Amino acid sequence: KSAIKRVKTTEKAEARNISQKSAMRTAVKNAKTAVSNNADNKNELVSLVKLVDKAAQSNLIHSNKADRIKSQLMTAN
Amino acid sequence: PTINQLVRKPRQSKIKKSDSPALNKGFNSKKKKFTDLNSPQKRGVCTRVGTMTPKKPNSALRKYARVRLSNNIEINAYIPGIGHNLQEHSVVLVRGGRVKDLPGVRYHIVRGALDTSGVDGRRQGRSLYGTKKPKN
Amino acid sequence: AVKIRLTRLGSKRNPFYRIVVADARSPRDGRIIEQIGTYNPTSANAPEIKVDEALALKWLNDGAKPTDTVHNILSKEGIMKKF
Amino acid sequence: NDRKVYVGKVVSDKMDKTITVLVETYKTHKLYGKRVKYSKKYKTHDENNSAKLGDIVKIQETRPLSATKRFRLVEIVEES
Amino acid sequence: MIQQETRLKVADNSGAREVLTIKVLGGSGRKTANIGDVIVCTVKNATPGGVVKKGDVVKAVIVRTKSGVRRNDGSYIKFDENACVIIRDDKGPRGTRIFGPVARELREGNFMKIVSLAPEVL
RNA sequence: UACCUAAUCAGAAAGCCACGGCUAACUACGUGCCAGCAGCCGCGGUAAUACGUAGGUGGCAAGCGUUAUCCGGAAUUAUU
RNA sequence: AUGGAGAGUUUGAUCCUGGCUCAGGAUGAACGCUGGCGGCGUGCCUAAUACAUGCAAGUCGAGCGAACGUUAGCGGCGGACGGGUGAGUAACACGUGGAUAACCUACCUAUAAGACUGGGAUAACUUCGGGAAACCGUAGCUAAUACCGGAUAAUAUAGAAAGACACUUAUAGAUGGAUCCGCGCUGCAUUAGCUAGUUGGUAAGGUAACGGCUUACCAAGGCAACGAUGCAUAGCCGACCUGAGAGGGUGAUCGGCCACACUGGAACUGAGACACGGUCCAGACUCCUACGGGAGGCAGCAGUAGGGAAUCUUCCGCAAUGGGCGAAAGCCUGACGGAGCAACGCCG
RNA sequence: UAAGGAACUCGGCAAAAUGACCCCGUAACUUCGGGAGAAGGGGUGCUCUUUAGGGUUAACGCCCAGAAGAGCCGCAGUGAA
DSSP, rough: OOSSSSSSSTSSSSOOOOOOOOOOOOHTTTTTHHHHHHSSTTTTTTTTTTTTSSTTSSSOOOOHHHHHHHHHHHTTT | OOOOHHHHOOOOOOOOOSEEEEEEOOOOOOOSSOOOOOOOOOOOOOOOOOOOOOOOTTSSOOOOOOOEEETEEEEOOOOOOSSOOOOOOOOOOOOOOOOOSSSSSOOOOSSSSSOOOOOSSSSSSSSSSOSSSOOO | OOOOOOOOOOTTEEOOOEEEEOOOSSSSSSSSEEOEEOOOOSSSOOEEEEESSSOOOTTTTOOOOOOSOOHHHHHOOOOSSSS | OOOOOOOOOOOOOSSSSOOEEOEOOOOOOOOOOEEEEEEEEEEESSSSOOOOOOOOOOOEEOOOOSSSSOOOOOOOOOOO | BBSSSSSEEBBBSEEEEEEEEEEESSTOOOOOOTTOOEEEEEEEEEEESSSSSSEEEEEEEEEEEOOOOOOOSSOOEOOOOOOOEEEEESSSSSSSSSSSEEOOSSSSOOHHHHHTTTTOOO
């Protein structure tokens, strides 16, 4: 009766539109592109702030994967 | 070549033959294999009437009505006692027991069991041999 | 949601409940995070409330309450009046 | 937290700074009672210190970073 | 144009897989037969199990033929191979399922049972 | 509606088995290699209390004979 | 050492090795029945026997649009968990430890956290051509503690939507899995052998991890007796008898785990599956029939059919013990409880 | 030469199938030679790249085709005998 999304939702969270997941994948496609082109998107590492007004304000990515890119960023400055 | 031996002969158990060749039988029809289920008694199909007249330590005309049981099996069965079933082509429980020194028949037949119970002549049993009608 | 669930384990029709820091998603035999000895409600011996929640003091700060509605069972374990 | 003492004898010796080491493990029959033995097989990243057939080596616990080498230590316990 | 010594492929699950025409019922002198005609044949190839065994004389009805029949409106409809269905005595299928399309000329032959099990009817 | 000493109406421990036995167990008839009995014994071609009925007897326990499943039996791939 | 241990069987009696015909208890039992009364328990043991069923479990504004605390239905939320039978892994799968330079640790509640910053808008409401149901058309919309990244803390040394008189980065309180070896695993004589990147080498990645995973290349009769490699196939354990101990057994229980969900196979946004009643694909099945369709738990309960010398009612309740919904309240439950059940042992 | 495929006939008589190269795969039996081309299953045109086979050759010029790809065309590529 109650839609499950806290227990075994491995395939329950993998059964709808992936447009937003694909759109977020295109935004994280410049991970090495901006680093190889020296973009200003990864500039000013005092913020990325990216822990005082980013994660909660507006964020929609992965966990461990993002954490890897959330280590060098938000701390470099 | 190079095919030598290492492991020697161990202490194997003596060869033995299972007794009562009529129990633990179950020929499959979907796999055509003997599906054992540890059954101490099967069914039967009385379709013959024996007449073992000559013998050795009997000095009397005996008999052995070969009755085919379940799992496509045929054994020389025999009805022990005076019970004379008059119902042919009918299931008959195979008495759980073999004969004693009787060349030919090597199995017994349970009295009654969805067939001719028997006669009320005897009344000293009141337990087996299709006994009934308890005298008062 | 993580209270002191009474682990119902032992023989049939007589489970020996043992108050332990368990979750609400794992009832009866689930997962104990902070075991608290065991409660004996046999009412035929002296040692009854033999709960050892010495390491369960950290549990009472972010997720700790009653699972099997045991107020008098937790009444003996008076570890409050200090906050 | 630290390392272990995987001291043993190196029998095989490959190239590209790679070689396997032999350990030792006791074994007894719980049902019977006869005492036997068994040797474990673990490779170790050595250079020239760890030899073979005699030269013993005291390998310590460390990052594997190999297909078989679980520990890496050139510390030799002997030299054939 | 199914005549004598003609091999057809059974289009049902009755056990048979191939039959051989033995005679075309309909009258003395009858040579060939088309869709909606009953014929006597023998099983030449059967599958393990089923109700019909090899070397059996049964009756079947044609449902598909290389040479298609002509309609009264001036239309035609030819198939790719000949096929039939082993029927009973009261025009009843001996199987339980039909495979492939079926001609709409079986509706005039009082074969509702066979025409109500065919996936397609054209 | 446990054990219950209470009203205290009268609501019933029978049984089946060996009985010459082996193995704690029987008398008369009827049988008489006809049938029964029938693990071990065997008892049936005449005096089978071994048979079948009656009076019974030894056992045990609300019952009794039966079928397939470990170990007393006994070391019996030995291992003591 | 609470300290086993009859015969026959062979002359006409015999000793002596040897094997069981045979002086007993046990008998998940049924049984032909003479089965007074009962506390307690097991009961398709014969049966992963086929399939009509009663049938999984409903909800919520402290945060929003009926006529009238949530009443409009969106959003928080077990269908995989209660369960069911155990053919299925001759083996870390379970039984059984430290552990992890094989390690992830999503997660569950407290405090930092100042309700910040880009927002339109969303189901209901409903403009709604038809269709036997077997589905397109005509389409505007309106919400809600539904809800949107960069510059100011975390491996540097390149913060929000709002609670009553909710809250978010950091993390704690807490939390689920992958792993090393030490432990359970048949023999073939009427088979006597098996791995070749078998045996070790490091580099394209990425997941609980090194990585013989592939990465460049690497040996001869080498591996293997440790029968590896073939089979045997079984759900594993905590257990009860047992020689008197020396020997020997080693699972019905009842819970953990490991499974399964017509048959397979490939994929599918929200918090830890292959899903006991979501997908698609195929196969042989289920049945009515508007020519199109629906498909099957009965592997949730109780039944019709199966052959069982050998086994539970298509009965009441959520007392309670539950947990999931859910400011309380509300609200859920063939989970579970109570009655039919047979000498199933009742011993008085 | 439409459907069919020995129903023809004393009898598959006479047609019709098969066929060259290349690659894979090959049974019973046996006097150990054989059976065996057993059976059976694939491939073949033209253009451009590569990097390489004996070379006429320094040469992989050029050419005989060795591989390895990428393309183009027809109903059909030992397109005939």
